[PDB]
Design a protein around this ligand. Structure first.
Ligand SMILES: [Mg+2]
Ligand SMILES: [Mg+2]
Ligand SMILES: [Mg+2]
Ligand SMILES: [Mg+2]
Ligand SMILES: [Mg+2]
Ligand SMILES: [Mg+2]
Ligand SMILES: [Mg+2]
Ligand SMILES: [Mg+2]
Ligand SMILES: [Mg+2]
Ligand SMILES: [Mg+2]
Ligand SMILES: [Mg+2]
Ligand SMILES: [Mg+2]
Ligand SMILES: [Mg+2]
Ligand SMILES: [Mg+2]
Ligand SMILES: [Mg+2]
Ligand SMILES: [Mg+2]
Ligand SMILES: [Mg+2]
Ligand SMILES: [Mg+2]
Ligand SMILES: [Mg+2]
Ligand SMILES: [Mg+2]
Ligand SMILES: [Mg+2]
Ligand SMILES: [Zn+2]
Lengths: 97, 49, 99, 86, 122, 58, 137, 116
RNA sequence: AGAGUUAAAUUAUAACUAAGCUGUAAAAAGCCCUAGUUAAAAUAAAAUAACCCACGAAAGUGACUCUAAUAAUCCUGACACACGAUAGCUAGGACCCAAACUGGGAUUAGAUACCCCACUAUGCCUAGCCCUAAACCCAAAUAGUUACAUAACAAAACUA
RNA sequence: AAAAUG
């Protein structure tokens, strides 16, 4: 008979889930400028999840795109292109201290 | 709708008559797929340079 | 006779909702050389750092403004059946009863 | 070999400071994992040992990260006790 | 677009590139494939010195040929472009546009796994 | 961020092959390890060399 | 004073000089620092060997040439032979991970050469040739 | 052996109006000439179900499932004729044969006229 | 399962420089047709990504591209059918590198072992066999429950 | 590095 009892309904304060920087984006093997931000400038390694911060699908997609572009003749393997060297820093890795 | 979508694209296909025009047009109209990202999640283009 | 559902529906904590980034008034009830024990009043007492500006004006019983972050800092660790309770709350200092 | 030289793993010296430039270069390789890779590739490791190494490293990393998380969580209670004598 | 062809042509003069593209597209059409668009990516530095046809190549022009071709004729075109001496590297892949972009829903928070060990008192 | 632990160990409810194989149970202990003392090394071999250069030359 | 550790690639229009020469004309010091020896060879930009000195050539012996002191002495002598031909700046290229790695690098500075750039060209096969079996069976 | 024409205007673009009014360029792209093998599998399934079955809509029926798996068995035998050392698809074909035989036994036990 | 391709390293092969190179706790043996740098096919393997946990029934699989393709309107079920890591056998081809065996050099009282060097079978491709593993996650398959209830340890106790 | 037995 109490009208002030809690009602079993969905959480209204549910915050939206965090998105990877490339949620609902198109990853391509021809976009060497985009692919270069996730590779080390000095050695050329592909950064991991703890460095990039991408949700599960886009990490595998960017890895596959880098590996395809490295063999199709679009991006160097051993180093990052100096033309794309001046791109904004998306990775969370800091070398010079 | 897909049939109608392809119908529009059938006009711009490359054919024997359009070979000489399309090759020269491609040789004079370069295209670039380069685009970068930022920490906020926005796309930035090199074409404004 | 008023029922607990009725008074809990009108309790200020119910009106606050989530405790993230909420402005509350607290009163300091204990003083350490550099740490201030501020009771914002919800469940626990938060601990804050004495600022550099008007640091002498913080005494026992002083009312201050807080931006509440969490009601109670608890988290899970490896091989733990329950949480590890910190017996405190998370809040930051903004001012001292600006009125 | 097929790539252009003097681009990868190259550090430019500033004001003749070679000792610190070498430390910067060493940091580059350690944080990219090349030093451990060379020391591991010196002698071949069997896949059975590689799986064990990966499992041990992952378990150790998980334990270390959880311990660091708990330490940072409990750093707040480092303050001097005001209820001494109770 | 169904298939994409990333044609790395040898760096050479404008009429020679025009003739090479014309004959390449003629070979594409002879196998029963319709070329939808032709895109030029420009002539840039190659990422590495590619050795093909007893020649060391440092430059090269990039071209993108997207088309509709039967699954049976994909390999013959590869053999033709392999023996074509003005092509540095022929590659036929699937066009990126035929894979629809699924909703990249976001970082779903995963909790810490629990009940991995019993409740024995240590 | 902490690496995931779901579906890693071999349990009754785990349907797949175990991924991680702990030497000891992954229970967070109540004491951290004692800090390691660094191994010493010889000092100024470089200056000893220039000291002995005078002796070998003169 | 905006200084970047990234190399001055010839593709750009930067203005950096060392003794009047560009970065592309400055000689190279290839330094192979093995686990038992350290070999230093100074070649020019045109890939002409100018100076060569190694711990084995320094009058050392079997195990005494593996120490960092032998590497430093080899660097000093290689620097002397390089200065004999009139060179001021060199670019060090380190190959391999060994004990005489940094010592033979500082050997050039001790012997009278200025180091402007250090490049780590270490052989890193991406699982190519299978290396030898592990010791201590 | 069945001979599906390459210019058949495959099922996904067959029941929509105005297919015959467009030109040969569109008709060729919407045909089996530009299609993969799965499209031909669907076409063969449709053509077999329209002639062998009595109710094409009742898919959950034993005889409809038998026809559907017969299509897959023919595809697997065609794959085997090209790949001899393939053991995975050999296992798939040999297990599909047993499944079809099991359901044929069930159909013989339940509905004899349909089985014949 | 087929077809095509190779980014790093390595090597057969040429050119300049040096008298040494490799080798270990230290040595010796070996190579000085040796070593460093600049160019370089063929074979073998597939850094980082992977702090990812997906595919396949299992063994097993993570360099790239294309084709074919991953049974069952989904219970259990053999001595029947089909697979089955590495190791081994037969025929043809390949052989950078690694290495059983073997021959030298160390240590030891002895060392037909651990340490160093060289090399063979072998690891590689096609075809045909062999049908074995700590083939283990030592936890059978199918639908479930958190009720009673810790021999000990370990991955908690249990139902049809 | 080395190094057996009761
Ligand atoms: Mg499975
Ligand atoms: Mg154990
Ligand atoms: Mg322990
Ligand atoms: Mg053993
Ligand atoms: Mg094969
Ligand atoms: Mg190569
Ligand atoms: Mg050969
Ligand atoms: Mg000797
Ligand atoms: Mg690889
Ligand atoms: Mg299935
Ligand atoms: Mg069964
Ligand atoms: Mg077998
Ligand atoms: Mg064999
Ligand atoms: Mg052999
Ligand atoms: Mg050998
Ligand atoms: Mg012997
Ligand atoms: Mg196994
Ligand atoms: Mg068993
Ligand atoms: Mg069973
Ligand atoms: Mg007990
Ligand atoms: Mg005795
Ligand atoms: Zn995302």
């Amino acid at each position: 008979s109490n009208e002030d009892l809690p009602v079993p309904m969905e959480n209204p304060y549910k915050e939206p889930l965090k998105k990877c920087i490339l949620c609902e984006k198109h990853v391509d093997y021809k976009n060497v400028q985009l692919l270069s931000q996730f590779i080390s400038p000095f050695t050329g390694c592909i950064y991991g999840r703890h460095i990039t911060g991408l949700c599960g699908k886009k990490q595998k997609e960017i890895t596959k795109a880098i590996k395809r572009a490295q063999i199709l003749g679009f991006m160097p393997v051993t180093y990052k292109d100096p033309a794309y060297l001046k791109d904004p820093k998306v990775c969370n890795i800091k070398y010079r201290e | 709708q897909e049939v109608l979508q392809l119908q529009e694209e059938a006009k711009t296909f490359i054919t024997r008559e359009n070979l000489e025009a399309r090759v020269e047009e491609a040789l004079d109209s370069p295209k670039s797929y380069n685009w970068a990202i930022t920490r906020e999640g926005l796309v930035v283009r090199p074409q404004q340079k | 006779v008023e029922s607990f559902a009725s008074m809990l529906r009108h309790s200020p904590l119910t009106q606050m909702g989530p405790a993230k980034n909420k402005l509350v008034i607290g009163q300091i009830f204990h003083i350490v050389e550099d740490d201030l024990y501020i009771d914002f009043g919800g469940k626990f007492h938060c601990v804050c750092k004495r600022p550099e500006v008007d640091g002498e004006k913080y005494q026992k019983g002083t009312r201050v403004r807080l931006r509440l972050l969490d009601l109670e800092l608890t988290s899970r660790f490896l091989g733990a059946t329950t949480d590890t309770t910190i017996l405190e709350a998370d809040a930051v200092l903004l001012g001292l009863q600006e009125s | 070999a097929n790539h252009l030289k003097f681009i990868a793993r190259t550090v430019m010296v500033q004001e003749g400071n070679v000792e610190g430039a070498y430390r910067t270069l060493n940091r580059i390789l350690t944080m990219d994992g090349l030093i451990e890779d060379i020391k591991r590739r010196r002698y071949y490791e069997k896949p059975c040992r590689r799986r064990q190494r990966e499992s041990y490293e992952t378990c150790r990393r998980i334990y270390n990260m959880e311990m660091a998380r708990k330490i940072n969580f409990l750093m707040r209670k480092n303050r001097a006790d005001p209820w001494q004598g109770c | 677009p169904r298939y994409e062809l990333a044609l790395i042509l040898k760096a050479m003069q404008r009429p020679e590139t025009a003739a090479a593209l014309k004959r390449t597209l003629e070979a594409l059409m002879d196998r029963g494939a319709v070329v939808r668009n032709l895109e030029n990516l420009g002539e840039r530095m190659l990422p590495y010195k590619i050795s093909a046809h007893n020649q060391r190549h440092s430059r090269g022009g990039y071209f993108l040929v997207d088309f509709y071709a039967p699954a049976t004729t994909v390999e013959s075109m590869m053999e033709h472009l392999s023996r074509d001496i003005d092509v540095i590297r022929p590659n036929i892949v699937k066009h990126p546009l035929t894979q629809e972009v699924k909703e990249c829903e976001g970082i779903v928070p995963v909790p810490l796994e629990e009940k991995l060990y019993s409740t024995k008192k240590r | 961020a902490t690496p995931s632990l779901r579906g890693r160990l071999a349990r009754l409810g785990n349907p797949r092959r175990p991924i991680l194989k702990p030497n000891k149970p992954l229970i967070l202990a109540n004491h951290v390890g004692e800090r390691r003392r660094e191994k010493g090394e010889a000092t100024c071999i470089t200056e000893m060399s220039v000291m002995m250069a005078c002796w070998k030359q003169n | 004073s905006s200084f970047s550790i990234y190399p001055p690639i010839p593709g750009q229009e930067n203005s950096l000089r060392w003794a009047g020469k560009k970065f592309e004309e400055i000689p190279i010091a290839h330094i192979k620092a093995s686990y038992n020896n350290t070999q230093i060879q100074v070649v020019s930009a045109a890939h002409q060997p100018l100076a060569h000195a190694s711990c084995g050539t320094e009058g050392f012996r079997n195990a005494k040439k593996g120490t960092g002191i032998a590497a430093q002495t080899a660097g000093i002598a290689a620097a002397a032979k390089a200065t004999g031909k009139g060179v001021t700046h060199v670019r060090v290229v380190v190959k391999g991970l060994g004990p005489g790695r940094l010592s033979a690098i500082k050997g050039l500075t001790m012997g009278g050469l200025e180091v402007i750039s250090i490049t780590d060209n270490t052989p890193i096969p991406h699982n190519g040739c299978r290396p030898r079996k592990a010791r201590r069976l | 052996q069945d001979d599906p024409p390459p210019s058949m205007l495959l099922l996904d673009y067959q029941n929509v109006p105005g297919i015959h009014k467009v030109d040969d360029v569109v008709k060729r792209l919407l045909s089996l000439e530009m299609a993969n093998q799965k499209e031909k599998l669907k076409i063969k399934k449709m053509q077999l179900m329209n002639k062998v079955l009595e109710n094409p809509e009742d898919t959950s029926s034993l005889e409809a499932r038998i026809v559907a798996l017969t299509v897959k068995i023919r595809n697997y035998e065609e794959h085997m004729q090209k790949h001899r050392k393939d053991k995975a698809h050999k296992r798939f074909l040999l297990m599909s044969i047993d499944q079809r035989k099991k359901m044929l036994k069930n159909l013989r036990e339940t509905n004899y006229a349909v089985f014949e």
